[PDB]
Amino acid sequence: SDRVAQLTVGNSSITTQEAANIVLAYGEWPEYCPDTDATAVDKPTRPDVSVNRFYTLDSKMWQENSTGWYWKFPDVLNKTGVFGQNAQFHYLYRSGFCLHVQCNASKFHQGALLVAVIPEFVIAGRGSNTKPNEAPHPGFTTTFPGTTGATFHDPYVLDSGVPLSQALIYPHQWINLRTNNCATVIVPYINAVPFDSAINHSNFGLIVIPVSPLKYSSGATTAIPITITIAPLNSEFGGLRQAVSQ
Amino acid sequence: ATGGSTINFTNINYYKDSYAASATRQDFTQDPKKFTQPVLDSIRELSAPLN
Amino acid sequence: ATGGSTINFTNINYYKDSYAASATRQDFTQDPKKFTQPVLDSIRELSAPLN
Amino acid sequence: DPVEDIIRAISSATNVESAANTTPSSHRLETGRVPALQAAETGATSNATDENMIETRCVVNRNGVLETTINHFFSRSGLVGVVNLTDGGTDTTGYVTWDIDIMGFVQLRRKCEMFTYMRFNAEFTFVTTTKNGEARPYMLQYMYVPPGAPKPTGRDAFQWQTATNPSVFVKLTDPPAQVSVPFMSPASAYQWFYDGYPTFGQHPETSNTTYGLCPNNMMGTFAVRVVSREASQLKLQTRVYMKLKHVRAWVPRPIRSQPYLLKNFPNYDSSKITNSARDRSSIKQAN
Amino acid sequence: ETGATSNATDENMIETRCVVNRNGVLETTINHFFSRSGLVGVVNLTDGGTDTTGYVTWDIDIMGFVQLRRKCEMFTYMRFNAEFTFVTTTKNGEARPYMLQYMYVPPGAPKPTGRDAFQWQTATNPSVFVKLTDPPAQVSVPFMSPAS
Amino acid sequence: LQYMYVPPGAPKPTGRDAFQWQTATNPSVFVKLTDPPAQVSVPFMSPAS
Amino acid sequence: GIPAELRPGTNQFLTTDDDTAAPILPGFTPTPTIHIPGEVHSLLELCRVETILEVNNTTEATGLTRLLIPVSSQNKADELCAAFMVDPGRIGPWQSTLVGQICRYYTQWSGSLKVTFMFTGSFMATGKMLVAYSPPGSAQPANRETAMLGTHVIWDFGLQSSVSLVIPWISNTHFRTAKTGGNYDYYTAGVVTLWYQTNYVVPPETPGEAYIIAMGADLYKFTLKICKDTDEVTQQAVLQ
Amino acid sequence: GIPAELRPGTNQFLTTDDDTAAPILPGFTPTPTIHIPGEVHSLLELCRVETILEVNNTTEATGLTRLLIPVSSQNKADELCAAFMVDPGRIGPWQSTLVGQICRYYTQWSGSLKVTFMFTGSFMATGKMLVAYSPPGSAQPANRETAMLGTHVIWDFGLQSSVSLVIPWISNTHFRTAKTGGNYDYYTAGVVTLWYQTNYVVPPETPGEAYIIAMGADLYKFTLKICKDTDEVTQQAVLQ
Amino acid sequence: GIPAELRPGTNQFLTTDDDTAAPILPGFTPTPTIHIPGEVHSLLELCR
Amino acid sequence: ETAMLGTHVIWDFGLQSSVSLVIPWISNTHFRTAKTGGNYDYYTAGVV
Ligand SMILES: CCCCCCCCCCCCC/C=C/[C@H](O)[C@H](N)CO
Ligand SMILES: CCCCCCCCCCCCC/C=C/[C@H](O)[C@H](N)CO
């Protein structure tokens, strides 16, 4: 009654036979914006089942030298499905997410993955330059990787200059290949403003990192992917206009 | 404790503005269970977590 | 809101004169209808102005 | 009627005025009940306690918990800025502006960056001295120039008429100036981390200088002069101390272990990363 | 053409949601807009060598400095009180320990003819005695207009 | 003047201008030699009783 | 006497501080008040009045023709006419409006604007227009198929001579700081364009062109905060 | 007026003093609050979260392998594996924990720590360990017959992958100052050692070694006092 | 504000004077007391 | 990425050895004639 779960959102559903509970970030569920907190006067749109549903990215393959990957949300979804279209025609976006990560292997494999959810996840230039002129900055394709994800140059300091060991403050879970093959976190809408622009601003990144490296003795399966499936719980859109991809 | 009849006054404000005042009124509220144990299915300390 | 038992005092005056004091007592009164719509025959928002 | 399909938090709050007590616990010999075994793969911390691990006595614990609240932790004045007003001979401006950014000094910066969102009030004290140190009896003007307001172009320029801008007039021999400031953000909270760009458009991949700069934090400029006609010959620094009060905080995040470089950017060295814990000779020698 | 402004509103032009609006309206009243000190005048007292008057008169007109003038001229008629602060410094800037006299000479009253002249006896005229090293003088003034 | 309290374990200042004087946490007193002498109240800070 | 301990803030003169000062005239009773028509209480009453947006603010607009929007019979249908940014505290056609001056003494604003268009034609001149509003985003719409996507209002020339495009508050923040761009361009409000819905159609013997007059105001929702000093004024020497 | 007599403490500016100061903006109403998830009230909520002790903090540990504890099949039974001091505000493996940073802004601490070990093996890897805690005294235990004498917990590798060694508060004082030794070494908390209970036993065809991950946290008993400024940060010049 | 007139005794520091001074540590709660044998209250107990 | 857009079910190999993809009735008509295409290909149900 624990390790077996099913998640049904929209026309999509996810089953897992090996799971460690579910994390509900900061003890809240996603929700629609209350009349008292709202500011913009126009009426938001609420597609429900056409937007809220599980989208599945490509799989990141899992090696011994892998340093770990990250994504940005909503950014990964801005080009996909009806969710990507609404976010282009509207200036004001709000919602939560349900994040699900699939990695499996066999009882002769081993490793662990740290899966975290980082609100306002800021990447950082890498260089010794102390002058804001000559100092390096990351590129747009790095800051906002898209569907293809990005990779860590320094996974230990999380590329932001902050130790990985304290990442356990964020809502997280581990994939420990002897214990569970999935990690699921349900993120509420977090932001200092009720609505925002899905295009200019990403609420939070996702992070998958090998704290303990993958090991398998020869003859077993070398190819392990990491798949990601994310659903936008409770979506709203406002400020309808023409289409802007960026 | 103690301090019998010490007639303390601090929060009295001399201005018409709320932010001119002085901290605090304190707060004793805590909710560690949102950061420390933010899981859907509650887990007891007796039971094993995974069954 | 909040500010439970903050014991505010401002308007207390130390002089025998009224103009020595400090503003305000505020005012929340408005009458925009005298500047914005100063017309004899009232006009509703539904109806067209001129018929 | 004709179309039917059209038709909370688990955690709660408790007051804690003192450290937790300890109840007595005896041994346990039996199966099925196992307080020690945890599984951390759920992201939840071990709930095991003193009393189920060993045998304990009873401890009434009157240790105070109070000093560690975010109000008491963050209400202290610490230096957010330094302003150098020459006004002396040779090239003489006659005034100096300081854009208000409290990220410029590390010691108070690392306390704030424990949190993503903050909403507070402020208490600013202005301690001005001369070049080495001293106080002479010169009159000063500290003026606040909010965003969009004209910045003063000269010592005597008209923007110092301050018919609207708040200003402070003070003598170097007076105790340091002090004022209370509200929460002025046009959003609902300050945020020290903004992953995003302020405007639309095509972003350069070579150099992004606009990445991570929140608009909501731009509070205007602080400007000093010496109230006078001709000029003084002195040279003075004003140190600016900000106290946080009535403060609220959201979404805690890890504490920065790497050396800071820039005010507005979390840039760190890709070379040279310093370990978070010092290194010993072997893992088997505790000392 | 009726001189009245459009009364059309948010809610009849488009479809709207419900917004409870707790934005404060308070800071924009004429009390808060106009209660700030701003410079109405500057007075130059030589008193030094060479030609020396020993005093300077300033007729009270607050229209002399533009920044506070344009706020007042938003309105045709005004009735208010006043709070005057006198910040005195030396030529470049400084404060020495010299005693000062700030005297108000209402219409019809004799203006002082010299540094020591008898009109400074001020048996009636209000005056302020202050040292350059003291915090700036300050007084409250009523509404003195003979009209309303 | 600056009178700063540096509790056990806290960095001691290395110079006149050194960063430990930012005192974002350490209590400090700023005072002029011409001011009446500084004064503060201190609690019972012993880790024993 | 009563033992006291003086604090920082002593001897400072803060321009905005609220304190008592000494009266000069003890026993002074002022001249009686009388009733005067037109009393104001808050400045938001004055921001609800429509004044004239200067849309033709461009060069070679001579003196007073800067306030007029030329409308004539087009050739290619679906044509643009005039465009202006919505930011009332920003340099542009709002710089001549009363609401443009008052939001310029404050650091921030929030609310719904309103834009009234009055067509001065001959009685015999007919036409339709499309007044569209596009929230922040890609730049000024290139077409009316792009501009119809925003908030728009179609307006028929006729007996009633004015239409009003209300500009609802659509924002991520509760407020918007009024300042220039490149950084503060985060707070830009949007773009108003005015397109030909059909055409300006006129009988024979009638003038072949007319002028629209645009006005602007605020709704009951509009507010302001953090009062400061305006940028329009400059002084050099004491006025004699 | 009221006769007054001024006292020492006049004109001093004490950074921690609680006083009223003058408002800059009379009549200012701030932007409305909204609900934001994840509010903190006290920092003790953040000290109850497990973060990762860096036990392999030694040299030649490369970058991220500093957090891992190598476990393999031994030869001589009864072997030591890793050891660290219990002082959370002291240089060492606790220097990377969140609870290690917050107790480092304070002069003193009291309470029960907690140390969680997570074994990442293959499902087929079995073993037992002995996690022992020895209060202050003679140096690090030399044997497991000496280390069993302290507070210890035996842990079997299995379905549930974590055990927790709670470190009860055992002290003569109510608090312990966090600082270096030779004098303040009076306040040293103790020593954690981790021994082989039996052995790391693995079938054929499976990797011959694994990694334990250690984490650390606090219990409901934990407190702090006398807030000060941390030693980890250093600044030289004003950040540009 | 409240008009005041300062008196002799201003700025003097009298060693035996009873006054309030500012706390250095807001929110400080000291280490709990315990019972210790042999408490003294007045020095006349020691003179007997 | 195109096939996730439809109705899908993710299935983990494990103790329970079967998953079931239910194929909801999604149609413009109430019925579908069963026959070949080119014309009756109007009634085609979909693709698994
Ligand atoms: C009479 C002079 C008064 C000076 C008043 C200045 C008040 C300014 C508001 C301060 C609020 C905190 C500052 C904002 C946060 C950080 O600096 C942002 N990173 C700025 O980029
Ligand atoms: C001890 C010195 C006290 C000085 C008292 C001076 C009070 C004078 C009344 C000021 C009232 C406003 C001034 C009158 C308005 C404008 O200046 C008029 N345009 C003058 O022509």
UniProtKB/TrEMBL annotation, chain A:
According to the lineage, what is the superkingdom?
Answer: Viruses
- Write out the coiled-coil annotation as residue ranges: none
Cellular location(s): Host cytoplasmic vesicle membrane; Host nucleus; Virion
Q: Which family does it belong to?
A: Belongs to the picornaviruses polyprotein family.
On subunit structure and binding partners, the annotation says: Homohexamer; forms a hexameric ring structure with 6-fold symmetry characteristic of AAA+ ATPases. Interacts (via N-terminus) with host RTN3 (via reticulon domain); this interaction is important for viral replication. Interacts with capsid protein VP3; this interaction may be important for virion morphogenesis. Interacts with RNA-directed RNA polymerase.
Task: Specify the protein name.
Answer: Genome polyprotein
Give the organism the record lists: Coxsackievirus A10
Upper classification of the organism: Viruses, Riboviria, Orthornavirae, Pisuviricota, Pisoniviricetes
Which part of the full protein is shown? 79 to 324 of 2193
UniProtKB/TrEMBL annotation, chains B, C:
Task: Report the locations given in the UniProt record.
Answer: Host cell; Virion
How would you summarize the oligomeric state and partners of this protein? Interacts with capsid protein VP1 and capsid protein VP3 to form heterotrimeric protomers.
The free-text function statement in the UniProt record for this protein reads: Forms an icosahedral capsid of pseudo T=3 symmetry with capsid proteins VP2 and VP3. The capsid is 300 Angstroms in diameter, composed of 60 copies of each capsid protein and enclosing the viral positive strand RNA genome. Lies on the inner surface of the capsid shell. After binding to the host receptor, the capsid undergoes conformational changes. Capsid protein VP4 is released, Capsid protein VP1 N-terminus is externalized, and together, they shape a pore in the host membrane through which the viral genome is translocated into the host cell cytoplasm.
Q: Which family is this sequence assigned to?
A: Belongs to the picornaviruses polyprotein family.
Instruction: Please report the name of this protein according to its UniProt entry.
Output: Genome polyprotein
- Native organism: Coxsackievirus A10
Q: Which residues of the full protein are shown?
A: 19 to 69 of 150
From TrEMBL, chain D:
Where does the Picornavirus capsid VP1 domain start and stop, copy by copy?
39-254
| Protein keywords | Capsid protein, Host cytoplasm, Host-virus interaction, Lipoprotein, Myristate, T=pseudo3 icosahedral capsid protein, Viral attachment to host cell, Virion, Virus entry into host cell
From its record, what is one biological process in GO terms? virion attachment to host cell
Localization per record = Host cytoplasm; Virion
Main site of residence?
Answer: host cell
- Gene Ontology cellular component annotations, sorted alphabetically: host cell; virion component
Q: What is this protein called?
A: Genome polyprotein
- According to the entry, what is the taxonomic lineage of the organism? Viruses, Riboviria, Orthornavirae, Pisuviricota, Pisoniviricetes
TrEMBL record, chain I:
Q: What does this chain do? A: Capsid protein VP2: Forms an icosahedral capsid of pseudo T=3 symmetry with capsid proteins VP2 and VP3. The capsid is 300 Angstroms in diameter, composed of 60 copies of each capsid protein and enclosing the viral positive strand RNA genome.
Q: Which organism is it from?
A: Coxsackievirus A10
Top-level lineage group: Viruses
Q: Which protein are we looking at?
A: Genome polyprotein
Q: Give the signal sequence positions.
A: none
Q: How does it assemble?
A: Homodimer. Interacts with host GBF1. Interacts (via GOLD domain) with host ACBD3 (via GOLD domain); this interaction allows the formation of a viral protein 3A/ACBD3 heterotetramer with a 2:2 stoichiometry, which will stimulate the recruitment of host PI4KB in order to synthesize PI4P at the viral RNA replication sites. Capsid protein VP1: Interacts with capsid protein VP0, and capsid protein VP3 to form heterotrimeric protomers. Five protomers subsequently associate to form pentamers which serve as building blocks for the capsid. Interacts with capsid protein VP2, capsid protein VP3 and capsid protein VP4 following cleavage of capsid protein VP0.
Quote the subcellular location field of this record.
Answer: Host cytoplasmic vesicle membrane; Host nucleus; Virion
Task: Give from-to of the shown chain within the full protein.
Answer: 325 to 372 of 2193
Q: Which family does it belong to?
A: Belongs to the picornaviruses polyprotein family.
